Ligand binder design. Structure first.
Ligand code: HEM
Ligand SMILES: C[C@]12CCC(=O)C=C1CC[C@@H]1[C@@H]2CC[C@]2(C)C(=O)CC[C@@H]12
Length: 452
């Protein structure tokens, strides 16, 4: 088969598509192009031919194989934010990615994943006793900020554990994400004219500088430590590899940065959407509270509990299915291949539109929010909210643990009301790199009223 998608009008086809991405935002552009042309189609971002694909088979093929274990984006943009061949998230150097990832993978599983369940709970508790920091005169909680703060505190105390300005760093993290999102697929042209990106350049510097203070402190503590054997966090593992020959300081410093931002960027917005769903679906809220009573009572949440929380698990999966945050995944072809029908040369970019695929493929009632969609054990080849394979989400296991931990410990204690008729559907969303609330609008607050 030849490849569907708009005409290559001898060099105008690329400019409209890229412009459309820049104009619409990556997510809505992908959805537009999949709705117009096929669920497997071609488009251009800068030069590079870039496939936008929603077919479950292609998704599976692509994520399954090692020769798609790269992403893509502006080299000038990635350099600007420090992800060019440095971290893991947008580190597209295969060998350098290959050696860095294992650090992330160790820290996000085994004993750290077990520690996480109580670290996550204790963090939320402490922030729920300080609700004055987040609540209005009219009782409106800034949930986004609350969640971002506990997610940061959580990440810090598990992976780095240096004291920090929670409030300031959360703002800086948002600044960094905005920049990352802004520059990821900007054309080279953009980067010449400098009163168009210094804005972003400074947001990056602010976060990078703030984190350099913390890693500096962390460096001192490691050098003057007695029991080096006993207390081995992520940041330390990295720093010790730098002290062997294995890693660059620059690379370490980005990995630490990338681990701290991860949860605040994605969990906060995911749980935000999950709370608006619980607010407007009392049928499900009871099922969850019932389950929590059966399973936990008023014992502290414990690792053994999380497997048992089956209803909440389905709620999480359906929330992510129905109203995602990470609705699309950027990959790159490292070797030539035939993919379903069509041929894909190496260097071809790929945007897997997993958000669309979860409304087209396996599910009984795809366009409404119901736990009926997860009544029958869903095969992992029809529902990848995290991705899988050699470059799937490194947080995928611990993320589910963390989301259960915070939902339990919040709902345990509080009923959650949304303002007005507001719901996930009526919230106005930006749909660019991720899918998140447009925070220049308002009515995004909630009300926490107790229980018993
Ligand atoms: C609701 C929460 C989350 C969702 C939905 C999510 C989703 C994803 C997805 C779809 C990817 C792309 C994987 C692929 O290309 O196949 C990804 C990558 C990644 N996620 Fe997450 N994630 C979440 C939370 C987290 C957390 C909490 C962490 C770390 C603490 C994390 C760390 C990462 C990293 C490091 C990668 C890059 C892996 C690589 O490129 O090698 N994620 N995530
Ligand atoms: C989950 C994630 C990482 C941790 C973080 O801090 C923020 C995000 C949101 C954007 C995700 C990204 C991982 C890679 C993703 C899936 C892509 O290939 C396109 C969008 C992007």
């Amino acid at each position: 088969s030849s490849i569907p998608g708009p005409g290559y009008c001898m060099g105008i086809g690329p400019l409209i598509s890229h412009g459309r991405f820049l104009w619409m935002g990556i997510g809505s552009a992908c959805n537009y192009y999949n709705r117009v042309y096929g669920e497997f189609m071609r488009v251009w971002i800068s030069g590079e031919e870039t496939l936008i694909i929603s077919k479950s088979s292609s998704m599976f093929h692509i994520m399954k194989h090692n020769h798609y274990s790269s992403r893509f984006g502006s080299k000038l943009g990635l350099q600007c934010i420090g992800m060019h061949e440095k971290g893991i998230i947008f580190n597209n150097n295969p060998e350098l990615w290959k050696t860095t990832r294992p650090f992330f993978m160790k820290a996000l599983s085994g004993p750290g994943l077990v520690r996480m369940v109580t670290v996550c709970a204790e963090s939320l508790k402490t922030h729920l006793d300080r609700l004055e920091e987040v609540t209005n005169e009219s009782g409106y909680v800034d949930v986004l900020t609350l969640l971002r703060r506990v997610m940061l505190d959580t990440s810090n105390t598990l992976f780095l554990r240096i004291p920090l300005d929670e409030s300031a760093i959360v703002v800086k993290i948002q600044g960094y994400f905005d920049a990352w999102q802004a520059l990821l697929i900007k054309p080279d042209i953009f980067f010449k004219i400098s009163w168009l990106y210094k804005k972003y350049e400074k947001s990056v510097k602010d976060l990078k500088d703030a984190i350099e203070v913390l890693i500096a402190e962390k460096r001192r503590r490691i050098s003057t430590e007695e029991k080096l054997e006993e207390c081995m966090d992520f940041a330390t593992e990295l720093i010790l590899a730098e002290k062997r020959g294995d890693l660059t300081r620059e690379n370490v410093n980005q990995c630490i940065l990338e681990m701290l931002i991860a949860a605040p960027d994605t969990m906060s917005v995911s749980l935000f959407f999950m709370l608006f769903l619980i607010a407007k679906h009392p049928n499900v809220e009871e099922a969850i509270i019932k389950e929590i009573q059966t399973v936990i009572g008023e014992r502290d949440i414990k690792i053994d509990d999380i497997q048992k929380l089956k209803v909440m698990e389905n709620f999480i999966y359906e929330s992510m299915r129905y109203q995602p945050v990470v609705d699309l995944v950027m990959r790159k072809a490292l070797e030539d291949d035939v993919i379903d029908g069509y041929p894909v040369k190496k260097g071809t970019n790929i945007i897997l539109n997993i958000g669309r695929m979860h409304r087209l493929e396996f599910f009984p009632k795809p366009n409404e929010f119901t736990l009926e969609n997860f009544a029958k054990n869903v095969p992992y080849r029809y529902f990848q909210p995290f991705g899988f394979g050699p470059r799937g989400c490194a947080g995928k296991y611990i993320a589910m643990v963390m989301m259960k931990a915070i939902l339990v410990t919040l709902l345990r204690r509080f009923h959650v009301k949304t303002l007005q008729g507001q719901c996930v559907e009526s919230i106005q969303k930006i749909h660019d790199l991720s899918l998140h609330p447009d925070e220049t609008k308002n009515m995004l607050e909630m009300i926490f009223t107790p229980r018993n």
